[PDB]
Amino acid sequence: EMVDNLRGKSGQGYYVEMTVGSPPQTLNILVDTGSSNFAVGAAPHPFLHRYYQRQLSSTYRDLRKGVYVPYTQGKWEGELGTDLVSIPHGPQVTVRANIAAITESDKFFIQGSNWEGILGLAYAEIARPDDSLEPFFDSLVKQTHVPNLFSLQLCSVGGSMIIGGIDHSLYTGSLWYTPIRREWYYEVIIVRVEINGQDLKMDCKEYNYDKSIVDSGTTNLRLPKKVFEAAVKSIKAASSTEKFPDGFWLGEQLVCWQAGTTPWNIFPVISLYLMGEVTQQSFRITILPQQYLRPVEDVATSQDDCYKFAISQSSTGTVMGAVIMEGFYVVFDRARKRIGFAVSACHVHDEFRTAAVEGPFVTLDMEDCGYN
Numbered sequence: 001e002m003v004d005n006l007r008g009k010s011g012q013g014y015y016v017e018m019t020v021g022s023p024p025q026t027l028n029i030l031v032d033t034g035s036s037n038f039a040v041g042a043a044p045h046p047f048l049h050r051y052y053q054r055q056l057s058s059t060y061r062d063l064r065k066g067v068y069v070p071y072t073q074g075k076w077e078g079e080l081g082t083d084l085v086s087i088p089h090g091p092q093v094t095v096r097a098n099i100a101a102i103t104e105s106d107k108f109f110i111q112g113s114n115w116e117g118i119l120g121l122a123y124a125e126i127a128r129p130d131d132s133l134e135p136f137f138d139s140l141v142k143q144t145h146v147p148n149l150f151s152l153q154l155c156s157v158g159g160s161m162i163i164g165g166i167d168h169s170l171y172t173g174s175l176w177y178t179p180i181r182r183e184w185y186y187e188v189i190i191v192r193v194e195i196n197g198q199d200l201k202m203d204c205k206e207y208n209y210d211k212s213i214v215d216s217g218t219t220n221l222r223l224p225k226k227v228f229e230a231a232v233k234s235i236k237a238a239s240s241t242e243k244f245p246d247g248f249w250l251g252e253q254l255v256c257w258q259a260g261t262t263p264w265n266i267f268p269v270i271s272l273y274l275m276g277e278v279t280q281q282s283f284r285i286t287i288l289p290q291q292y293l294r295p296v297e298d299v300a301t302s303q304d305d306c307y308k309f310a311i312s313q314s315s316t317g318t319v320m321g322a323v324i325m326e327g328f329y330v331v332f333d334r335a336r337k338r339i340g341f342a343v344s345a346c347h348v349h350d351e352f353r354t355a356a357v358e359g360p361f362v363t364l365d366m367e368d369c370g371y372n
């Protein structure tokens with residue numbers, strides 16, 4: 001009953017229905033493995049269809065403490081409190097959890113996105129104001145018998161968040177696991193990067209400067225400057241049969257082709273090799289251009305199919321965002337401190353190429369690829 005419990009619009013996040021308060025107030029909540037605060041609009045905003053009304057909830061408790069949260073994109077401030085929370089299309093339980101009532105925000109809420117709040121599913125260590133503010137999923141596990149694990153299948157868009165388990169109907173082939181290096185973000189280690197089978201030939205610590213995270217709340221694949229520049233150079237070379245403006249590669253400008261004629265074949269596959277659970281072993285996940293060229297829906301341009309380049313530069317480490325997670329089933333195995341990847345039942349791919357998760361691979365170089 002949890003399958004297909006996510007919705008979204010491309011590039012605007014995936015959200016699950018939740019209720020807060022007594023009696024329950026229904027809100028759509030963005031699922032974010034890249035943060036650890038549960039926060040909801042709690043005052044009028046031009047882009048909010050509805051918001052949390054604390055005065056109507058008998059079970060609301062004010063914590064008399066403000067909080068401020070800056071993201072890569074956007075920021076908000078609010079008042080901390082606790083209240084009862086449920087997930088209608090998740091486990092059938094009710095938990096009391098911390099909630100940040102957003103009273104002011106800047107470039108956070110998105111016009112027409114259909115969500116009114118955000119569920120930070122990462123660890124207390126990056127919670128604001130500090131790590132003593134217990135994250136929602138921690139409260140969920142403490143207060144119920146739900147297993148300490150959840151999985152995400154991100155595919156108008158939809159998908160599934162399976163809480164407490166793994167649904168075999170959502171993937172094919174094998175699940176490969178990479179260790180969670182540190183429990184704050186869902187931090188992982190990338191050991192090798194190839195573009196159309198060609199190694200970028202970098203010291204592997206560069207791939208994880210200064211960290212690499214799995215982040216459902218970030219749209220793009222974000223790469224450290226040095227890695228980004230090398231990637232773009234190789235993708236340009238592979239697709240050189242056509243030339244695009246530098247603004248396209250900066251992720252700022254659209255590229256369009258006549259409807260139905262996108263030249264997928266001139267764009268390379270990208271392989272990210274992730275540290276395995278055994279010494280010097282790895283597996284790779286392979287991303288097709290259908291993933292890193294993000295379609296931008298606009299009726300005005302609909303004579304064409306237009307895309308944004310959904311790989312962009314980072315100064316804060318690698319971010320494996322939605323572009324990467326789409327077409328994979330991703331298991332956040334908190335209990336065993338590992339992340340699993342498998343090919344998703346909802347894959348794009350064409351008649352020539354298919355996204356993959358495969359291994360094992362062995363590395364002779366004994367260097368630790370972690371930055372710290």
Ligand SMILES: CCCCCS(=O)(=O)c1cccc(C(=O)N[C@@H](Cc2ccccc2)[C@H](O)CN[C@@H](C)C(=O)NC2CCCCC2)c1
Nearest residue numbers: 034035069070071072073074108215217218219220251312
């Ligand atoms: C021209 C290129 C544009 C690229 C846009 S893009 O793809 O980066 C990009 C595109 C869309 C969103 C974001 C983005 O910052 N995502 C937020 C959540 C969010 C979701 C929806 C709207 C606004 C925000 C994550 O939480 C980001 N996760 C960590 C990286 C993070 O910043 N964690 C915080 C650490 C400090 C405490 C709070 C959590 C980035």
